[PDB]
Structure 1
Amino acid sequence: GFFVPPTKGTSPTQIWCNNSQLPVDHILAGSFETAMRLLHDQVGVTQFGPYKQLFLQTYARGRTTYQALPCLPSMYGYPNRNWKDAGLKNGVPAVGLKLNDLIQRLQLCYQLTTVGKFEEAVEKFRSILLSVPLLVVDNKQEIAEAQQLITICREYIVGLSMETERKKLPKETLEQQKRICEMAAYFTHSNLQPVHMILVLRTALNLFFKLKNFRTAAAFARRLLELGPKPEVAQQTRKILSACEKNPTDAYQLNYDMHNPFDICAASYRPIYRGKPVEKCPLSGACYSPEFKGQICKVTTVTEIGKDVIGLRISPLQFR
């Protein structure tokens, strides 16, 4: 016999796929269809268009390269994160994106918000949100931070998106104005950080003051002061608040309850109280009124609103 053509062994990238349930690991292996399926089932990704750059970019860092014999096609290397104990069967791809990287980029988002560039802020924010399911976290608390990081992103995305619309609506009708005040007050309930929470409270205060809805304005004034704004703002706020006390009454009844638990409709920008029916993005936690079930989330831009899912998977720990 002597010469027998040898049969292919299993490729390193295939090994990675057979070894992980983590999306990024499959993207790193070039297994897009497999990666997309994982993202579709764990979280509810359905519109993968805005995930193109993440995939290609992630994929481009998957394998190193080096030459063997001159003139022949070069060799590819497949660095493993567990290179020490990875046999020729237990390898899993090196990690090229970490939680800290995402948390760090959050600051540019915070900056952009403060200086009023809401549109760019939403991009950076969305960019981080979509990147969380591409992590490979180590411990259980690191998994909580990832979930909390996603939460921050949607909170600001629907909050800022709502605001940019309110600024677009017309301000002629009394109705048109009651609508603006309402939206402005809804922002008041977003969980941003103090420096921003203050900026939106400051805004709502003015709107409600002009709408001669002084009783509700006084409450906004008190919540703002407790946040400890800069001196000038605090002073202005005390001034408006004493004005409001001369006539502690709201002219018009608005569709807003400051004491009844909300959930902003990320599409219509209207309140969905305590136990009312709501449809939520399986990934961002974004909320929508039942009408929108089955539609592509406006916050995530790639997710399906009604979709039932396994849940975010970014750590082997999550597979007991």
Structure 2
Amino acid sequence: GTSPTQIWCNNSQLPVDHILAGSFETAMRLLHDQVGVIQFGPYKQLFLQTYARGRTTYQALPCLPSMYSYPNRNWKDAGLKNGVPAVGLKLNDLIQRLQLCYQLTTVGKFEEAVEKFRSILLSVPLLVVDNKQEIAEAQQLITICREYIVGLCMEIERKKLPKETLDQQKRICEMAAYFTHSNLQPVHMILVLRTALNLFFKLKNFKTAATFARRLLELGPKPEVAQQTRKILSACEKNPTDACQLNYDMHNPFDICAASYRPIYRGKPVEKCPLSGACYSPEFKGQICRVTTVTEIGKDVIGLRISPLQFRL
């Protein structure tokens, strides 16, 4: 007859369903078309893990091979024909993990934070989502992950680059400033602003520093920080002026190149990761996304398909 796993495959477009089924090739294809995922290698743990949960086992008779049971999320209604695998991974689970990521960011554990963030980001396509808004949250969740990943990754590099040349220094300040734009939560956003302010201050680009200081204050950082910020701000006011011109436009909209960590203003051509939304300069197109690590930058895709609602007829 037809195996239950096969039934699941026939029944659902969702990639997780196929993984549960054990149909890797099918699942990979779905991930490849719906999302960009060219490089499956980072996926392997997720697949096996997901795969393991798919079916239960019980023994009909002794000394014979054990039987397998396939749980269905719609067990009641599903007949033999319309079964679909039980869930097992949910949006809340992913959201919960996010806090741990936040914690690591605050501590300065950025490298570890990236891993957790990326782990969640990759996991999003696995989900089966019940309602339309819930789908939006998933998309939003992914966005948050890339934002941190690119931002944190940019930060790690900035620290690495050499301080010695003036040009080198200008580069650092620029990158620090770029971080400012990243959409993080206020606790983190404040932290980055704090950093940028100092770099700009030493740079003697006081005018720009003043703007950062004001933005920081609005956030409402702890009192000690706020006081320090006010102190710096007043100093900046004495000589509001930027000594050097930097390749940074606070006002102009940006898009940080995930690879280059260079600004891409407004309209200027950009290539984006189908999955993450990470942005890259046109040169990168066709390459593996640094943020996602699985995806192809240039790839056009159907789009994430977490819920059956997405399919319409």
The alpha-carbon deviation at position 237 of structure 1 amounts to 0.0
The alpha-carbon deviation at position 271 of structure 1 amounts to 0.2
Q: Tell me what 1:268 maps to.
A: 260
The alpha-carbon deviation at position 216 of structure 1 amounts to 0.2
Distance 1:199 1:311 in 2: 34
Secondary structure at the counterpart of residue 96 of structure 1 = coil
Distance 1:167 1:262 in 2: 21
The alpha-carbon deviation at position 76 of structure 1 amounts to 0.1
The alpha-carbon deviation at position 238 of structure 1 amounts to 0.1
Which structure dedicates a bigger proportion of its chain to helix?
2
The alpha-carbon deviation at position 263 of structure 1 amounts to 0.2
The alpha-carbon deviation at position 99 of structure 1 amounts to 0.1
Distance 1:294 1:134 in 2: 24
The alpha-carbon deviation at position 219 of structure 1 amounts to 0.1
The alpha-carbon deviation at position 276 of structure 1 amounts to 0.1
The alpha-carbon deviation at position 299 of structure 1 amounts to 0.1
**Cα deviations across residues 226-263 of structure 1 (Å, max 9, x unaligned)?**
00000000000000000000000000000000000000
Distance 1:69 1:134 in 2: 36
Secondary structure at the counterpart of residue 160 of structure 2 = coil
Distance 1:69 1:238 in 2: 78
Distance 1:214 1:15 in 2: 66
The alpha-carbon deviation at position 74 of structure 1 amounts to 0.3
Report matched runs for 1:1-320 at 5 Å: 9-320=1-312
The alpha-carbon deviation at position 224 of structure 1 amounts to 0.1
Distance 2:212 2:25 in 1: 50
Q: Say how many residue pairs are matched.
A: 312
Secondary structure at the counterpart of residue 17 of structure 1 = helix
**Cα deviations across residues 199-242 of structure 1 (Å, max 9, x unaligned)?**
00000000000000000000000000000000000000000000
Secondary structure at the counterpart of residue 97 of structure 2 = helix
**Cα deviations across residues 138-178 of structure 1 (Å, max 9, x unaligned)?**
00000000000000000000000000000000000000000
**Cα deviations across residues 31-56 of structure 1 (Å, max 9, x unaligned)?**
00000000000000000000000000
Runs of 4+ displaced beyond 2 Å: none
Distance 1:111 1:153 in 2: 14
Q: Which runs of 5+ in 2 are unaligned?
A: none
Distance 1:265 1:316 in 2: 33
Distance 1:45 1:193 in 2: 28
**Cα deviations across residues 76-100 of structure 1 (Å, max 9, x unaligned)?**
0000000000010000000000000
The alpha-carbon deviation at position 118 of structure 1 amounts to 0.3
Q: Which runs of 5+ in 1 are unaligned?
A: 1-8
Distance 1:139 1:118 in 2: 33
Secondary structure at the counterpart of residue 154 of structure 2 = helix
Secondary structure at the counterpart of residue 60 of structure 1 = helix
Q: Taking structure 1 as the reference length, what is the TM-score of the superposition? A: 0.97
Larger Rg: 1
RMSD: 0.2
Distance 1:314 1:277 in 2: 29
Identical aligned residues as a percent: 97
Q: Taking structure 2 as the reference length, what is the TM-score of the superposition? A: 1.00
The alpha-carbon deviation at position 104 of structure 1 amounts to 0.1
Secondary structure at the counterpart of residue 68 of structure 2 = strand
Distance 1:232 1:93 in 2: 54
